[PDB]
Design a protein around this ligand. Structure first.
Ligand SMILES: Nc1ncnc2c1ncn2[C@@H]1O[C@H](COP(=O)(O)OP(=O)(O)O)[C@@H](O)[C@H]1O
Ligand SMILES: Nc1ncnc2c1ncn2[C@@H]1O[C@H](COP(=O)(O)OP(=O)(O)O)[C@@H](O)[C@H]1O
Ligand code: ALF
Ligand code: ALF
Ligand SMILES: [Cl-]
Ligand SMILES: [Cl-]
Lengths: 431, 431
């Protein structure tokens, strides 16, 4: 005796509860490396990734604990190794972060805590290891090694000088301060040593902006997924454009899904998309579509090579496919109402949830990380899922993100994330 | 104007051909390392993987060229570095393999050539690099480093002593010969050096049976996928059991697909499966199901924890879902006949192909590589796809593999692959 859950449609054993109804290991990811090595960029982008694929992850940025504890930054003097008081403030900030890590993992349902600090000494890492061990937490280390002066300078310009630590600073003096800050750490810096001392630690060393990796003792599937991700991201700037198919005939009829073709306005969008792309004047631009006709017709207007992904097809509405929202309310009032109250987890009978979409889209996201400029012509539910990943929107908000017809979303890197610009292509469509 | 292809259902631009109709880089993977380091095991298992996911791959095992050129092996004396004639035979075998690599990649449609030899000197690798460069082939190196005497001995016992090179040998003398063979290579062995000399090569060094990896300059998505795979396989023995759901009510009716429940014989299978598993007497056994009721009912009979994968659900027959094969022939004679002539690539309208299945199953296969003992309770088309991967069956044969109801397929490692044993659980079912 199994029953199907109403929202997610999962078969579960009938729990004929008795008259008194009665009701693995979390991981600490330890960032390691000199200042302006990408530790915070990695921490946030990895966390963005892990949350989107359904692993509860949170960043514990010790520098933010320090900013909050100390109130205003004046100089690199705070980071001198001979600075006894600042050392103990720094240490207290780390312990306060660790307190919060313990609470997040052991009491708030978190799976992955990203412990973002320098962690450049064996003694500090021994301290974190002791803490993970006493809490039954796994520990995975990510060290970023970058000795290239151009990359470090560029990192300082891009994220440091505009930091609230330097609000009372100009660029040249910000840069000069930050360079001296970095030199404070150099004498005591003990890089991870997997071939000797760190033999037994689970780690990845990311070398020269991802050109080279050293990987030791991956222990489980989450570490395995983390490593895979870290090995496929790159820092060089690029643009991602996302749009729906031009309006289609089912849009005109208010019928959901199917495989209908472009209306005459959908085809006007497709020509305008073509003019938009040409005006972007990109050296190389990849174009991706789903396998549904409306996206492929749209891409055909571009006269560029394109590639079809079945993983980009619109959410499968199962028994509701091809129905209007009025016929859904009437034939399946119960299904309509379940969906409205739990829109992310809700599965159409014999169809999909947004949650299912996320899993189908995982390889699309991994390949997008590998690409440079890309235009993705897709579908409402798909686009929302992709946008949530790029803009770090939660599961609960994902199915409501605003993704109208005939509008390009243009995503560009700024600092520790993505900026979105909307470009409406001035072609009417149903609402 | 787009038309949908008949077999694969792909939208393509109508090719209104004129009256005269007119009609990237391949990769050489270079194995590196001492004898009995797993080079051939890796070459074959990687190739098995790449072919199953649709990348045409072939192994060029230089040792097999040498076996064929020289006729009978007597001793390690053949591999002495002072052996002028054998050196030139070895070199000629390598060049003949390279000739075949060129032909496979440049003329036969191959994408990945796995060049399986020792390749232990910088001079030999320079030679292969020159060959890839002059052919416009990419080159990716995989070195296996293993200094553990227990692993090397175990490798010799498992694959070497039973080699046709040692047909006129007993174990002790086979082992002794092979150890001296290995020592021939040690003086001239130049390991890959990514931190200096090999700075510019695309490579992975696999260290101590996958405990540690060094990765340099992954150039593209195929190398990226290769690395991911190599990092998630392990050599320790284990068993995989595969079976269909116990017979279901749609089986009884000859209706395909749906989400029907177990018949009374399907439930007798489920109890017997339970007794079969208990008799296997495994320490730890993972159980995986799809999200369709019939597999989950089957797993419930086991009283073990199990995990549901949507990726394990039966092929989606789209418009043919829930129809009998007689109603399919009658309503869709054309679809019936397209399927019969091209069964792997054929997609049901609004449904799936075996090809689609393979893509959905990729993460199931990657996680299976990470596991130890696993029982997968699934569905006919799924099981066939999985079996093809484990038994290295081609795409064309995959949809015909024999996968009857109420029968466990038990897969165990032997040498460079998997052995299958069939265990019928003595419970009748429709045919
Ligand atoms: N692996 C890497 N090596 C060096 N720099 C990187 C890496 N990944 C990202 N970056 C750069 O790091 C910059 C941000 O540095 P940040 O993360 O604030 O450093 P940290 O936390 O180490 O002080 C971004 O400009 C990004 O381009
Ligand atoms: N990374 C590895 N390191 C060491 N041994 C391995 C590795 N991977 C597989 N093996 C073992 O290699 C054995 C087969 O060796 P083989 O592939 O014939 O070696 P080679 O081609 O280097 O002479 C198998 O028993 C398998 O267990
Ligand atoms: F049918 Al749509 F975005 F409107 F996939
Ligand atoms: F319905 Al089956 F194997 F018979 F999935
Ligand atoms: Cl310091
Ligand atoms: Cl030799």
């Amino acid at each position: 005796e199994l029953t199907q859950s109403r929202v997610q449609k999962i078969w579960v054993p009938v729990d004929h509860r008795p008259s008194l109804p009665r009701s693995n290991s979390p991981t600490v990811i330890v960032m390691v490396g000199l200042p302006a090595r990408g530790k915070t960029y990695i921490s946030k982008k990895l966390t963005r990734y892990l949350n989107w694929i359904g692993v509860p992850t949170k960043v514990f940025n010790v520098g933010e604990y320090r900013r909050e504890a100390v109130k205003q930054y004046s100089s690199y003097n705070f980071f001198r190794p001979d600075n006894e008081e600042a050392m103990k403030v720094r240490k207290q900030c780390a312990l306060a972060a660790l307190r919060d890590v313990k609470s997040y993992l052991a009491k708030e349902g978190g799976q992955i805590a990203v412990f973002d600090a320098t962690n450049t000494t064996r003694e500090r890492r021994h301290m974190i290891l002791h803490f993970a061990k006493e809490n039954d937490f796994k520990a995975f280390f990510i060290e970023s090694v970058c000795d290239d002066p151009t990359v470090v300078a560029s990192n300082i310009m891009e994220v440091k000088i505009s930091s609230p630590d330097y609000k009372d600073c100009n660029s040249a003096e910000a840069m000069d301060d930050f360079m001296k800050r970095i030199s404070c750490y150099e004498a005591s810096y003990q890089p991870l040593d997997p071939d000797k001392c760190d033999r037994d630690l689970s780690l990845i060393k990311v070398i020269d902006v991802g050109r080279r990796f050293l990987v030791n003792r991956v222990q489980d599937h989450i570490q395995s997924r983390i490593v895979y991700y870290l090995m496929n991201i790159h820092v060089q700037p690029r643009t991602i454009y996302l749009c729906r198919h031009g309006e289609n005939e089912h849009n005109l009829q208010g019928r959901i899904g199917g495989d209908s073709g472009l209306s005459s306005r959908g085809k006007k969008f497709a020509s305008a998309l073509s003019k938009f792309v040409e005006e972007q004047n990109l050296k190389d631009l990849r174009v991706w579509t789903s396998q549904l006709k409306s996206t492929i017709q749209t891409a055909e207007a571009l006269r560029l090579p394109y590639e079809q992904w079945k993983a980009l097809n619109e959410i499968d509405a199962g028994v509701c496919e091809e129905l209007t929202y009025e016929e859904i309310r009437d034939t399946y009032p119960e299904e309509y109402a379940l969906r409205e109250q739990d829109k992310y987890y809700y599965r159409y009978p014999t169809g999909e949830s947004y949650q299912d979409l996320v899993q189908r889209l995982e390889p699309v996201i991994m390949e997008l990380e590998r690409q440079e400029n890309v235009l993705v012509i897709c579908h409402q539910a798909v686009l929302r899922c992709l946008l949530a990943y790029f803009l770090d929107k939660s599961a609960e908000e994902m199915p409501y993100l605003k993704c109208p017809l005939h509008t390009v979303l243009k995503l560009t890197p700024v600092a520790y994330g993505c900026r979105v610009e909307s470009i409406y292509l001035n072609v009417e469509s149903v609402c």
